[PDB]
Every structure is written in C-alpha cells, then in structure tokens.
Design a protein around this ligand. Structure first.
Ligand SMILES: O=C(O)[C@H]1Cc2ccccc2N1C(=O)OCc1ccccc1
Ligand SMILES: O=C(O)[C@H]1Cc2ccccc2N1C(=O)OCc1ccccc1
Ligand SMILES: O=P(O)(O)C(O)(Cn1ccnc1)P(=O)(O)O
Ligand SMILES: O=P(O)(O)C(O)(Cn1ccnc1)P(=O)(O)O
Ligand SMILES: [Mg+2]
Ligand SMILES: [Mg+2]
Ligand SMILES: [Mg+2]
Ligand SMILES: [Mg+2]
Ligand SMILES: [Mg+2]
Ligand SMILES: [Mg+2]
Lengths: 343, 343
C-alpha cells in the first residue's frame, strides 16, 4: 500500500513535467503551436491510468536508497524517471491502439480515434518517446546513472518493439491459422511485448538510481519481474474478453484481431476436433455473432475457471521465485508488486 | 566528388550492419521471426536512395580527423554512424509516407502501401529507430563521443518530430485556409522537419567523432547547415510538383495534402484577389482536375522561374555564410555539400 502514500505526490509532479517540457517555446516562439499540441498529447495520453508502472520507480527508490540519501532532489529525479516510464507506455499504447484498431482506453476514446487526430497520432507517439530523453537529461544529466537510464529505456523500447512485431506477425489480419498459436510462441510474445517495460524497466530504473548496477543483481531481479509480466499479460488477455468493461477501461479486440491470446492457446489444447473447427470458422472476424461464438466455446471449456486456477499457481510460483532471487534486495520491493497484480 | 570515392565502401558496409543486428537471434531463437521481419524492413526502407546524408558523415570524418587517426576501426565506426543517419531518416520517412498518404518513394511503392504491411509499418518504423541506438552501442560504446552521438540523434529526432507537428498542424486535412501559409511559419517548419536531421546531424556527428565538441563550433556549423536545409526543403517542395517523376522517385501530394508548400506561400504573395480565390477552391483536394488547376495557376505566376532565381541567390548567400562561419573547419566540408545540392 506504499503506493497510495506516494500516488498523490506523483500525480502532482506531472504539472511540473508538462511545465518543464513546454518551457522550450520560452526561447523558440516559432514552435509554439507544436508545443501546444505536445501538451494536448501529454494530457490526453499520459493522464487517466493507475500509474502503477511509474509509481513502482518511486516506491522501489525509497526502499533501495538509504533514507539519508533521499534528499528533495533525489525524490524529484525519482518522480521524473517514474513519469518517463509512463511516457514510454503512452508512446507504445497510442501506437498499439492504432495497430490493434482499438476503440477505447482508460474509459475514453483512443487518441487516434478522436476527430482531427487520425494517423497524425503516429507522430504524436514519437514525441511522447522523445520526451523521455528530454526529461532524463534536464533532470539526470549530471547523475552517475544517467547513461544507464538512457540505455535502459532504449533497451526496453527495442525489446517491446521486438515483442510487438511477434504479436503482429502471429496475428495476420484476415488470416486465421490456429497452428501458430503455440504456448512457446505465446510466452515469447508476452515476455518481450509486456514483461520488460511493465515490470523490469521500473524496478531496474530505481536500481540504477540506487547505484545498484551489478549484472547479477539485475539478472536476478529480472528473473522475478519477467515471470510476473508473463502472468500479467495472461490476465490482460483474460480480461480482454471476460473483464468488466467498466473496470478495464477498454473494449476487447483480441478475437477480432486474430490475436495469439492466452485464451485461444488454452482453448486449442483443450479442444475436440469438432470444437477446433468451430473456433476456426469464428476467430479473427469482426462479426459480433462470430466473436460471441468463440466466447461461448471458451466458457464451454471452463477457461474462466482454468484462468482462476493458474492465477493461484502463478502466485505461488512467483513467491517461490522471490524467496530464491530477492536477495540482496528487500523482498518488499517484489512483494509490493505481487500484492497489486494478484487479486 | 569525394562522395563517389566513398559510396561503394559505404553501401557494402550495410551487409555487416544487417548481419550485426540479426546477430541478436543468435542467443534468442524465440525472436527469430521478429528478426527476420526487421531484416525485411531494413532492406526495403534503408536501401534504394542516394545515401548522401550518411555519406556526409564519412566524407566529413576523413576531412576532420587527422589521417594518422583514421585507422580501420575509426572508418568502421564512421560507416556505422553514417548508416545510423540513414536509419533515422528511414524511420521518419516510413511514418511520413503514412501520414502524408504518399504512394511511392525511391521509385517503389511506399512500405505501408505494400500488401500485408499496412499500419504495422508504424512498429516497423519504431524498430528502425531502435536500431540506431543498438548500433551506436555495439560500435561506439567505448568511444569518448558515445554519449554525444546518442544525445545528438535523440535531439535531432525530437526536433524533426517537432517539425513534423508544425507540418501537420498547418496542413489540416480537408481544411483549406491559406491564411496560415505565411513565410515565417514556412521557415520554421522546414527548419525543424528537415534542416536539422538532413544537414546538421551528419556534419555534427562527424564533428563529435573528431573530438570537436565546442559549442561555438557547432553553432557556427549549424549556421551554415540550417540555411542549406532551408534551401533543400524548398527545392523538395518545388520538385514535389515540377520535379521529374523518373528522377524524384516519388509522386507529389503537397497540394492534395493541403501542405504549407513553398510554392503555395509564393503563390499567395504574388496573387490577385481573383487568383487567390481560384487557389482556394482547388487546394487540398484529391480531385486530379483541381490539382491540375492549382498547378496551372503556379505556372501562370512564373513560380518555376521564381524558384530558379532563388536557387541562385540562395547559393550565393550560402557561400557568403561559408566564408564567414566555416573556420576553423575546412571549407571543403561545407563546399562538398553545396556542390551536391546545387544544380
Ligand atoms: O497498473 C497496471 O496495469 C499493472 C502493471 C503494473 C506495474 C507495476 C505495479 C503494478 C502494476 N499493475 C497493476 O497493479 O495492475 C492491477 C490491475 C490490473 C488490471 C485491472 C485493474 C488493476
Ligand atoms: O540526397 C539528398 O536527398 C540531399 C540531402 C543531402 C545531405 C547531404 C548531402 C547531400 C544531400 N542531398 C543531395 O545531394 O540531394 C541532391 C538531389 C536532390 C533532389 C534530387 C536528386 C538529387
Ligand atoms: O493486449 P495488448 O498487448 O494489445 C495491451 O496489453 C497493450 N500492450 C502493448 C504491449 N503490451 C501490452 P492492451 O490490451 O492494453 O491493448
Ligand atoms: O515533403 P516532406 O517534408 O513530406 C519530405 O521531404 C520528407 N520529409 C520529412 C521531413 N522532412 C522531409 P518527402 O517529399 O520526401 O515526403
Ligand atoms: Mg492493444
Ligand atoms: Mg497490441
Ligand atoms: Mg490485451
Ligand atoms: Mg512526405
Ligand atoms: Mg511530410
Ligand atoms: Mg516534399
């Protein structure tokens, strides 16, 4: 719950972020209209979520850095790096919503779907990315971990991008072929498209800021964090169809997009030649009726129950991993995360 | 002509680049399909142009760094940084072709227009960007200019992105309003969307590699380079409509896209209330007839001649700038560039 005691201070620092970024037109009036657009873009896409990823940088920071070294300037940099993680995600989600033909996100209409935005949202996403490195310099240029954060963020983007590539290759539009929906392919996708930036990135950022840059340390943290991410994308896939729309804040499109979802991979393993054929003739299509068909098949195979059983086993497994790789880091760093993503 | 004597060695180094980048799946077989896609993406979008921007990094490198310090490893890094500039452009052009609804580029069909690619090209562009920093590390991580190159490339992207924002704001789809097509707005757009990455970036990269990191030096080089860029985007705008399609390698879309072109800004200044009205009812529309109308108006105002007159004045002006700000750098560095973009 260390998050709630940090959330308010985090969400308020955003004003300073938007203020420091727009402080560019202060010397270049000519790009005023562009800066105004960036602000609109920041306020629409960076605001509105739970901010857990960015908060994880703050929280972990106060648990890693010794209290004496937590001055006002350190907490200032920590909030910024946390907003960088949020910007990195805004960058990916804006573009992801376009490539997934999504309709909503965080209860509102997807940025690109907004009248007047359209494909211009592609450049809007590029600017959100650029802002990550602009902030990293304005606030951490003099820090000893500067370069480390830059490489970590670029690394995390490359990995995510590699992961989005698998996501899109395995889900060719209007090209249904359940054969490629294997468990191995699935784990690879989620590992790269979600696990790295959603769990490793935040913790690793805090680690580097705390001077902890040991390869073995990061690899151990990564061992726990990537496994958490795997579970998270599984849940995201599950909620995509069985989630409460008034809670998820976004309409599902996995079945229509012909995505290699956890639900489809699970369905295939537990399906009779008859069912398999039913899934094949209704998957990856926009027809509401067909999508309702696939769902009925999922509920018939008790997937919603299979998911609840995995969440538990996953939880136990992740905890077992913490007991083995947490040290020398405070177990709470990982325990705080597990508490938030599990029930 | 120092370019021609370097071109072949440059275009051949690409194989090593594609080889070093794909050398990632060597330890991560799971992302094999993604690496294959990246290769396809690199080969389709990074190959096919004149490579002047990247060549400029090589050329300038051999003119800045003392012969004794031009070992095999230095020329290796120089070719890489040059390919990074080409990748940065591939990144922007892929996305630019989508946002401009372009049809061709370099004589071939635009990447996103290719069957099976579509909006997935958005992530393909993101990967091209990621590759810039992957190469910079694999080849220059130990160099003293490493961080400088990283910041220069990110800076150049941010500026370009700021510039693409002005380009898109000033050209709202289906929203014709010639009032915003002013000369000042125009200079701002071209300055950010083209001048920085097409002329400053290449020379600056070579400078940093040559140890020349003085602020005053860069600012002086920038004085010359940005002015060259301004001229170049003007020519690009001119060729967009009056260029030889079998030479430009791309179909024009400025008028249809309602772009704040140099030609439209020039037309507005030299137009009677009658003409102004004609331009207003035919600009920013897909109808071939209407676009043919605007063109006829342009030829009526002798714009193709006005352009030829500006190219000359621009040339003299740029040369005057070299006589003033070239030093301490070898004038040839800038003279080589001027020779290539002027007639
Ligand atoms: O916020 C998120 O999306 C995920 C990602 C994340 C990273 C670090 C710490 C917590 C969390 N999350 C989390 O706690 O999610 C909980 C959740 C998941 C789905 C619906 C509602 C809440
Ligand atoms: O290659 C380019 O597009 C431009 C950009 C550039 C940067 C550095 C040095 C030369 C050049 N160019 C150049 O020489 O262009 C010449 C040109 C322009 C238009 C059509 C054909 C050749
Ligand atoms: O299911 P996706 O992977 O597309 C998603 O989780 C976003 N995303 C993108 C990369 N990783 C995750 P979302 O359901 O939020 O649209
Ligand atoms: O005219 P644009 O600025 O769109 C262009 O020059 C590309 N570009 C993009 C940024 N700067 C230049 P192209 O005519 O090559 O499509
Ligand atoms: Mg999505
Ligand atoms: Mg997606
Ligand atoms: Mg999902
Ligand atoms: Mg264009
Ligand atoms: Mg453009
Ligand atoms: Mg053009």
């Amino acid at each position: 719950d260390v998050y709630a005691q940090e959330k308010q201070d985090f969400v308020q620092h955003f004003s300073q972020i938007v203020r420091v970024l727009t402080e560019d037109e202060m010397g270049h009036p000519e790009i005023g209209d562009a800066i105004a657009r960036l602000k609109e873009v920041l306020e629409y896409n960076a605001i509105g979520g739970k901010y857990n990823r960015g908060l994880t940088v703050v929280v972990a920071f106060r648990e890693l850095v010794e209290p004496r070294k937590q001055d006002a300037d350190s907490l200032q940099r920590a909030w910024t790096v946390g907003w960088c993680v949020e910007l990195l995600q805004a960058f990916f989600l804006v573009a992801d919503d376009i490539m997934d033909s999504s309709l909503t996100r965080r209860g509102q209409i997807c940025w690109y779907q907004k009248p007047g935005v359209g494909l211009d949202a592609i450049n809007d996403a590029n600017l959100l990315e650029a802002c990550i490195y602009r902030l990293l310099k304005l606030y951490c240029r003099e820090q000893p971990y500067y370069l480390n954060l830059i490489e970590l963020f670029l690394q995390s983007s490359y990995q995510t991008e590699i992961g989005q590539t698998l996501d899109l290759l395995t889900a060719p539009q209007g090209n249904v072929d359940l054969v490629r929906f294997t468990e191995k392919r699935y784990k690879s996708i989620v590992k790269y498209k979600t696990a790295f930036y959603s769990f490793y990135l935040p913790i690793a950022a805090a680690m580097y800021m705390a001077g902890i840059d040991g390869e073995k340390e990061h690899a151990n943290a990564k061992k726990i964090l990537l496994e958490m991410g795997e579970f998270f994308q599984i849940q995201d896939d599950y909620l995509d169809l069985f989630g409460d729309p008034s809670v998820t804040g976004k309409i599902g499109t996995d079945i229509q997009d012909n995505k290699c979802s956890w639900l489809v991979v699970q369905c295939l393993q537990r399906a009779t030649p008859e069912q398999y054929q039913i899934l094949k003739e209704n998957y990856g299509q926009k027809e509401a009726e067909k999508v309702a068909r696939v769902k009925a098949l999922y509920e018939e195979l008790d997937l919603p129950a299979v998911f609840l059983q995995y969440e538990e086993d996953s939880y136990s497994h992740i905890m077992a991993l913490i007991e083995q790789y947490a040290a020398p880091l405070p177990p709470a760093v990982f325990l705080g995360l597990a508490r938030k993503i599990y029930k």
